[PDB]
Amino acid sequence: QKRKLQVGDKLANRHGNKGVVAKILPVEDMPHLPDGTPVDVILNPLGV
Amino acid sequence: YYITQVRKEKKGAGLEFATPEEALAAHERGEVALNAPIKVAGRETSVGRLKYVFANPDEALLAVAHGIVDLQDVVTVRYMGKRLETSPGRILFARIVAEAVEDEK
Amino acid sequence: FGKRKGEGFGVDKREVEVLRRAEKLGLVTPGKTPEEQLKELFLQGKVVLYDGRTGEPIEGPIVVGQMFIMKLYHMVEDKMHARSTGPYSLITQQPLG
Amino acid sequence: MLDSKLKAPVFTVRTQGREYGEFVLEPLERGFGVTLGNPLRRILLSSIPGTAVTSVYIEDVLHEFSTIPGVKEDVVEIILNLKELVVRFLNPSLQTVTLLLKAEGPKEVKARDFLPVADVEIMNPDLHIATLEEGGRLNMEVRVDRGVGYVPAEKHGIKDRINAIPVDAVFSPVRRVAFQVEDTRLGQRTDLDKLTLRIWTDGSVTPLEALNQAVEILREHLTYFSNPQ
Amino acid sequence: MLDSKLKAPVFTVRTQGREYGEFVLEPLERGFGVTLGNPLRRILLSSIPGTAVTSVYIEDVLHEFSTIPGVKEDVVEIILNLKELVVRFLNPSLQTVTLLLKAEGPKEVKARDFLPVADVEIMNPDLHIATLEEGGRLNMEVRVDRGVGYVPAEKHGIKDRINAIPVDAVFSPVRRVAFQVEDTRLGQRTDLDKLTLRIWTDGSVTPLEALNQAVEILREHLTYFSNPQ
């Protein structure tokens, strides 16, 4: 079975920032750069 | 937090408006120039308070939305019975709570 | 930003706006041109970002970039266990699955 | 109609007086309440053009930081109270109206004390301008204009009389805007946007009127996409 | 017209192909380029309709996780490359079009290898479907539909042939949106908003078309403020 990323899943960089997906946002409204390229994932600073 | 903090930028020329009237004018124009900031260490009122005075509560934030005053900037405002020298953000926090529970006072 | 120059346009009201708040912060050398300021601000690893929901900018430069990220395996426990009624141990009469 | 079109934005309204007015509208697809409320808000505050005190001239006063004898309030508190004044002219012919007022002695000066002007109306009569003691001489000319948004007194710098002092521009009958996008459940799919925007107004216009004007300005702007070049 | 109305949004367009299309419009009052570009953007990505591979049927293959002899790619990589395929039909009469393709032996299978269909066009000819070695037998039927947004293959579950396998729906014809609000100087006042929005598209529709559809969805929504309650 194919497992597409979902809210229950947990991803983490090689440094240790571990975390779970809490919301899949519509590309519609998430943080976008001046040129229309939007961001894929928004990491909280407080965990740093 | 970030919404209620106030800022302080550059102290170069005199910070004395407590007394001279030439002090209001000169440090207002010099501020308009590049020498005095909107948040300068000048006891009574940094020119940032000199420039903007807000009558009603709302008046304050509108200026913020239009790009006149950042939330963390030091400005003067007229609340219930006092002329209070408090920043936008701080004034806004006030409302959040004042609204959460309507017993404003 | 080079392509941005040639492609035909310059700087936003928004782009300048975040700059104002950025210099009052201390990220950009006051007095330089927005073009020059953004370079500075970029070198710092952060760039201007607009909300997306409102289209307004996010007061203060935010960092962004290519971060590698892996997905972690879901253990059998991950399978959220919800039980209404079911088996029961033979000697101890407490619920068993 | 019955299926997708009957399933249409149920425009519901709740308005008390001319100041407050809530407006609910649902169902909406994904992330549209936001797509609509936000623009309307931006319009509701800048575009519903309005009126505000743009300049003042006290006859004996030269600078804004002065105090008038027999007058409890100082120039700065009065020019502030004028920002509170809400007027209403009826037609374009009135771009800049100078309201005049002169009062002497033991009288309280309210906005109703301004000499009436033909096409102009003062919705803020009982507002408090000043408290005059004895030998209290206050004769002023307060300018009024029709504009949009907020304009610092520094930005315009009006010059009717050389000893006059500019005032900051508060141009909108709309006091504040607020919209919420809460989920609503409609049978099949749960993901649904419910847009409800609360509008406040000084009284000049009404929340409903405001909103309508708003949507129009947007519409009119959507048409400007007509002739390519 | 001559003064304020002739001074109107000069709609200028620049479009190459059906993918890219820049759209400039100025002058605009204060903070409107943002007021307009943002909503359009939100619309341009969520609201517009397109085309995407909704189902596939390899003749000897039963499940999606199989591998075909003489074929380097595996079923999963291929159904994936199909998602990359961009088609374009010309009229409503074409809701679901089944594209057919069969190739054998030492040939590379590209999208141009699909047998032509009357009212349908493939903008993605040179896309790579597979690499066939020898005795390489690949005969498939890939469905194509007109829809909106993203629809997981799980959600629709298409059933043309029992051994077929659904594919995830990638319907917004719009790849990416981008708008800039640079200052423009027009005679008297400098504060001016210049709105230019760059739109990209898979080819199904065109930037211009897209934009038009967009503004309409907005307009249609501004009318939903009609009947109070």
Domain positions in chain D are 1-49+172-225, 50-171
| Pair of tokens at residue C91 | 């000697």
* E175's tokens: 């790849």
Rounded CA separation E1/E165 (Å):
60
Name the residue among A4, A29, A36 with its Cβ closest to that of E176: A36
Omega of the bond prior to D152 within 30 degrees of 0, cis? no
Q: Is A28 on the interface with D (CB under 8 A)?
A: yes
The identity of residue E175, as a single letter, is R
Cβ separation C59–B70 shorter than 8 A: yes
Do B33 and B27 contact (CB within 8 A), yes or no? Answer: no
**What does the alpha-carbon distance between residue A6 and residue A21 come to, in Å, rounded to a whole number?**
7
CA distance E182 to chain C (A): 5
d(CA C48, CA C62): 6
Q: How many residues does chain C have?
A: 97
Dihedral (Cα; D148, D152, D153, D157), 10-degree rounding: -80
Instruction: Give strand ranges (E) for chain D.
Output: 10-16, 20-28, 50-58, 87-89, 96-104, 108-110, 120-122, 128-131, 137-147, 150-151, 165-166, 169-170, 174-183, 193-201
Report the residue from C9, C54, C56 with minimal CB separation from E180: C9
Residue with tokens 């307060």: D142
Q: Which fold has domain E1-49+172-225?
A: Gyrase A; domain 2 (3.30.1360)
* Residue E129 phi, psi dihedral angles, 5° rounding: -90, -50
Q: How far apart are the CA of B15 and the nearest CA of chain D, in angstroms? A: 19
| Residue in A10, A38, A41 closest to C72 by CB | A10
Q: How many of the other CB atoms lie within 10 Å of CB of D64?
A: 19
Our measurement of the distance from residue D195's CA atom to the centroid of its chain's CA atoms, rounded to an integer in Å, reads 24
User: E132 has which bridge partners?
Assistant: E71
Q: Torsion over CA of D75, D81, D86 and D89, rounded to 10 degrees?
A: -10
Do at least 3 CB pairs under 8 Å connect A with C? Answer: yes
Residue from E6, E8, E95, E105 nearest E50 by CA: E95
CB of C29 within 8 Å of a chain B CB? The answer is no
Q: Which residues lie below 8 Å from residue C55, measured CB to CB, with a gap of 6+?
A: D38, E34, E35, E37, E38, E39, E41
Kindly state the tokens that stand for B68. 């006149």
| Contact (Cβ atoms closer than 8 angstroms) between residue E110 and residue E124 | no
Distance (Å) from the alpha carbon of C38 to chain A's nearest alpha carbon: 12
Smallest Cα distance from A12 to chain D, Å: 29
- Touching check for D184 and chain C: CB below 8 Å? no
Q: Side chain identity at B56, as an amino acid letter?
A: N
- E207-223 vs E33-46: helix axis angle to the nearest 10? 100
Question: Hey, what amino acid is at D221?
Answer: H
Chain A residues whose CB is inside 8 A of the D31 CB are 26, 28-29
- Residue E114 has what DSSP assignment? S
Q: CB of E170 within 8 A of CB of E52?
A: yes
Q: What Rg, from alpha-carbon coordinates, does chain E have?
A: 23
Instruction: Using an 8 Å CB-CB cutoff, list chain B residues near C28.
Output: none
DSSP B10-48: ---S---TTS-SHHHHHHHHHHHTTSS-SS---SS--HH
Q: How far is CA D94 from CA C36, D50, D66, D121, E57, in A?
A: 46, 12, 31, 12, 73
Fold of E50-171: RNA Polymerase Alpha Subunit; Chain A, domain 2 (2.170.120)
Asked if residues E47 and E57 have their Cβ atoms less than 8 Å apart, the reply is no
Residue E83: both structure tokens together:
């998602």
Q: Which of C50, C51, C53 to mutate to test the interface with D (most CBs of D within 10 A)?
A: C53
Cα B67 from chain centre: 14
Neighbours of D180 (CB within 10 A): 13
Q: Do C21 and B70 touch (CB under 8 A)?
A: yes
**Contact between E217 and E49 (Cβ < 8 Å):** no
Q: Looking at CA atoms only, how far is residue C60 from chain D in angstroms?
A: 21
**CB within 8 Å: A34 and E177:** no
Distance from CA of D150 to the nearest CA of B (A): 7
B neighbour chains, 3+ CB pairs within 8 Å: C, D
Provide the chain D residues 35-74 that lie in CB contact (below 8 A) with chain E: 35-36, 38-39, 42-43, 46-47
The token pair that represents D146 in the structure block: 């029709």
| Spatial distance between the Cα atoms of D214 and E199, rounded to a whole number of angstroms | 27
Counting one residue from D and one from E, how many pairs have CB atoms under 8 Å apart? 88
Both tokens assigned to D78: 């009065």
Q: Which residues of B touch D44 (CB under 8 A)?
A: none
Angle between helices D33-46 and E33-46 (to 10 degrees): 170
- Pairing verdict, β C70-71 and A10-12: antiparallel
User: Which helix or strand (DSSP H or E) is residue B53 part of?
Assistant: strand B53-54
Q: Does D32 touch chain A (CB under 8 A)?
A: no
Assess contact for E122 and E100: CB atoms under 8 A.
no
Alpha-carbon span E3 to E189, nearest angstrom? 15
For B17, the token pair is 């408006």
CB contact under 8 A, C8 and E41: no
Contacts of D42 (CB under 8 A, 6+ apart): E31, E34, E35
Instruction: Name which of D220, D226, D229, D228 is nearest D47 in CA terms.
Output: D220
Place of tokens 């309307």: D40
Q: Which of D30, D36, D148 sits opposite E46 (nearest CB)?
A: D30
Instruction: Collect all residues of chain C within an 8 Å Cβ-Cβ radius of residue D34.
Output: 53
Q: Do chains B and A touch (3 or more CB pairs under 8 A)?
A: no
Task: Tell me if B72 sits within 8 A of B45, measured CB to CB.
Answer: no
Are C13 and C37 contacting, i.e. CB atoms less than 8 angstroms apart?
no
Calculate the alpha carbon distances from E178 to D138, E22, E39 in Å. Answer: 57, 9, 12
Spatial separation of the C-alpha atoms in residues D88 and D91, rounded to whole Å = 9
Centroid of chain to Cα E127: 16
What are chain E's partners, defined as 3 or more CB pairs within 8 angstroms? Answer: A, C, D
Provide the residue type at A33 as one letter. Answer: L
User: Is there a contact between D207 and D177 (Cβ–Cβ < 8 Å)?
Assistant: no
Q: Does C87 reach chain D within 8 Å, measured CB to CB?
A: no
Please tell me the distance from the alpha carbon of residue E56 to that of residue C59, in angstroms, as a whole number: 48
Q: Which of E12, E42, E227 sits opposite D229 (nearest CB)?
A: E12
Beta-carbon contacts of residue B49 (< 8 Å; ≥ 6 apart): B74, B75, B76, B85
Report yes or no: E218 at the D interface, CB cutoff 8 Å: yes
- Name the strand (E) or helix (H) holding E50: strand E49-58
- The answer to whether the Cβ–Cβ distance between D170 and B65 falls below 8 Å is no
Quick one: which of B48, B44, B19, B43 has its CA closest to B31?
B48
Annotate D36-74 with DSSP letters as a single string.
Answer: HHHHHHHHHHHTS-EEEEEEEEESS--STT-B-TTBSSB
- Residue C36, amino acid: E
**C-alpha to C-alpha distances, C59 to C19, C33, C51, C62, nearest whole angstrom:** 9, 19, 10, 9
Phi, psi (deg, nearest 5) at residue D144: -145, 135
What's the rounded Cα separation, in Å, for the pair C28 and C38?
Answer: 8
Q: Inter-chain contact C55–D38, Cβ cutoff 8 Å? A: yes
Residue with tokens 């959507």: D222
- Those chains having 3 or more beta-carbon pairs within 8 angstroms of chain D are A, B, C, E
Local structure of D107: helix, strand or coil: coil
Q: For residue D87, count other CB atoms closer than 10 A to its CB.
A: 24
SS (H, E, C) E74-91: EHHHHHHHHHCCCEEECC
How many CB atoms lie under 10 A from the CB of residue D108? 11
Resolution, angstroms, 1 dp? 2.4
Nearest by CB: B70 against C24, C30, C31: C24
> Could you tell me which chain D residue has the CA closest to the CA of B32?
D154
Neighbours of B101 (CB within 10 A): 7
How many Cβ contacts (< 8 angstroms) between chains B and C?
A: 17
Of how many residues is chain E composed?
Answer: 229
Cβ-nearest to E229 among D11, D38, D208? D11
Whether residue B20 has a cis bond before it, omega within 30° of 0: no
Q: How many residues belong to chain D?
A: 229
Q: If you count DSSP H runs as helices and E runs as strands, how many of each does chain D have, helices first? A: 4, 14
Give the tokens for residue E100. Answer: 């057919």
| C10·E38 Cβ contact <8 A | no
Give residue A22's identity as a one-letter amino acid code.
Answer: A
| Tokens read off for E17 | 């192909």
